[PDB]
Every structure is written in structure tokens, then in C-alpha cells.
Amino acid sequence: ARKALIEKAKRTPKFKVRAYTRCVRCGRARSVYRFFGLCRICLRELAHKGQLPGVRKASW
Amino acid sequence: EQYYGTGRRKEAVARVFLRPGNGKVTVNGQDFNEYFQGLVRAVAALEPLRAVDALGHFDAYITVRGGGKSGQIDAIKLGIARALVQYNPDYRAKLKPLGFLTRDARVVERKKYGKHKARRAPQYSKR
Amino acid sequence: KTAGXPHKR
Amino acid sequence: GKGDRRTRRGKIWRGTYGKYRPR
């Protein structure tokens, strides 16, 4: 239950509650940031890669 | 007509204006003992002049924002001690030996990932 | 060893 | 204490308001 579920998420749901976030890149239904539309894993991979504008490792 | 110092300590910043007078102080638009009422530590912000005997010779107009009422106090204690050496550079000695000329960098340490606070750790238990 | 489908466990 | 919703400290603890901590 993966590809059918990554496709059903894009679909408009019978009710606005059944809509849930989903990583655009890998398809994770969990730990999905609204801002990037990514998940915590892909977010880390693209940040280290430099393909996320302005984002960088924070240090304080 | 004025003598100014900037006192900082722990997110609290102080602007001290020392004008000659009866020894009357106000802080943020109200009286000293009105703004520090009930805080025994309050009498420590006016300690530097005790070292130069300037007790009742200066009135003080002082504003403070940020931090907390005890961090604000230590800022005042540095601020007036910073204005006095501006008024009288000779106040260098007898003030620096009393450490009134320095600001402590002692601020809150950041919380870190995998702890409860900066150093308090989650409880350990093998098995 | 790891339940998943038929193998269940 | 903080566990009693029917007091001010409890309302603060759960971050709610009511008769026992109004605005």
C-alpha cells in the first residue's frame, strides 16, 4: 500500500478532513513540513545538497 | 547638566542619567522604591557611589527595559558606575578594584537536543 | 523475524 | 495545584480560561 496511497492523497477527498499531507518527493505521510512540502528526511538531503534556497545549518 | 552610562546584564539594558541633586532616583517614570518595592537586592544597584561617597550628591533619571527586575538591577549598578567614571575619570581606581566596571557575560545557556535543559539529562537506566 | 503479509509471526 | 482545572493555577497550566481565570 504505497503508490496507490501516494496517488489517493493528491485526489480531492470526499471530505476536507480525509486530506492529509504527503511528501512530494518520497511519499512520507509522516513528519511533513507544510513550508517545503517535504519530509524531515528529504528536507535534510536537499539542505546538505544546497538545493533549498537560503536554507543552511543553524548554529548558536 | 547630565552624566550617562549604559549598563547591560542578561538581556536587561539600562540607561542611567546622573544629574547633581538630593540623591533622588526614578526608574521608568516612577520612583526607585516604587519600581523595586520588596526586592531586597534593590539596594545593590546604588552601590558604586558608596565607593566614591557620592551618595546624595546625584539625582538619577534611569530607564530600563528587557530582562528581569534583578538583571535590570545589575545593569543599573554598571550604568551609574559607567557614568561616574565619565563624570570623573579618576574614579577608575577604587571602582575597578571593586569590579564595578565590568559586565558579566553570564547568560542563559541554550537548551540542546537530547537533554531536558542545557545540561540536565534524561534519566538513565540500563535495561 | 519480521511480520509482513503471509509471514505473520 | 497545577492539576486542578477548577483553580487559577490549573487554568494557567492547561492554558485555558474560565470562571476561575477570566480575561
Binding site: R40, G54, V55, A58 | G114 | - | -
Partner: protein
């Protein structure tokens, strides 16, 4: 003539602030200097590993710096010259009155 510009890289942001402030310093009159607004920070804290390892993280921030420049007396020689200006891609500008 109220001009605010934004970006993630401040070096590109402060650069384009110095350009425009000197565009009105050529033709025009009074510039209100490039005043820096407080930086708004959106942070992201992630479990550093793909599985299980909760007590190991990694922090990421996204900084959106803000600069403000005000042109006092416009003089449409400036309002013309501004149309031709090299504005890098890392900066987005907004103008009101």
C-alpha cells in the same frame, strides 16, 4: 517613495540596498539610509537519522532579512532611473508611498 526589499542572502540584499540608495543619491534629493529591519528566522529541527535515533538532531534556519530605504523628494528623474537597475535574483523589492 517607500522602498522595502527582502532576501535570504543579506550580502545580495545589502548590495541592492546600496545601489538604490545611490540611485537617488545621483538624481533626486534626500535618501533615508538603508535601515536594517530585524531578521525573521524560521527554523527546522530534524531527526538526523532516517529511523529511531531520536536524541540526534540537526538544526536548519531560513533567514529572511529586511532592509528599508526611503526617498524623500522623488523628482521623476529618479523614478525613471530606478526602472533600469541590476537587481540580483536573491532579492525581491516592494515600493509604496
Amino acid at each position: 517613495i517607500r522602498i522595502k526589499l527582502r532576501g535570504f542572502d543579506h550580502k545580495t540584499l545589502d548590495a541592492s540596498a546600496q545601489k538604490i540608495v545611490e540611485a537617488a543619491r545621483r538624481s533626486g534629493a534626500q535618501v533615508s539610509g538603508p535601515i536594517p529591519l530585524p531578521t525573521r528566522v524560521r527554523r527546522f529541527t530534524v531527526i538526523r537519522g532516517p529511523f529511531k535515533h531520536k536524541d540526534s538532531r540537526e538544526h536548519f534556519e531560513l533567514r529572511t532579512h529586511n532592509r528599508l530605504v526611503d526617498i524623500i523628494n522623488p523628482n521623476r528623474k529618479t523614478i525613471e532611473q530606478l526602472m533600469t537597475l541590476d537587481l540580483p535574483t536573491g532579492v525581491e523589492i516592494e515600493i509604496k508611498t
